[PDB]
């Protein structure tokens, strides 16, 4: 089920990623890191996402 959903819906996410990539420069692209660890995915959220 997860394989089928990712095959059908990857194009929409690819367009979304490209749009937000145009907002940040190359310096921010190669420098920013998730040092604090605030954005951590819960296991129930991950398997329900796909």
């Amino acid at each position: 089920a997860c394989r089928d959903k990712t095959s059908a819906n990857w194009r929409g996410y690819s367009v979304l990623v490209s749009r937000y990539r145009s907002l940040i420069p190359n310096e921010l692209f190669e420098s920013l890191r998730n040092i604090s660890g605030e954005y951590n995915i819960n296991p129930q959220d991950e398997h329900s996402f796909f």
Partner: protein, 50 residues
């Protein structure tokens, strides 16, 4: 459905390729069948000598 694949994979496959995939899995219903023609007893209207 039967072979557990996605639409994107089978998008580029031809009829002969698709027929082999289903037949290898054991599915024999991959062929079209021609209907048998039956002639009318009388000449059709507005169709002289036909």
């Amino acid at each position: 459905f039967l072979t557990n694949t996605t639409y994107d994979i089978v998008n580029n496959d031809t009829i002969d390729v698709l027929k082999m995939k289903l037949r290898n899995q054991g599915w024999p219903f991959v062929e079209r069948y021609n209907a048998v023609e039956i002639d009318m007893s009388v000449e059709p209207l507005r169709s002289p000598g036909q």
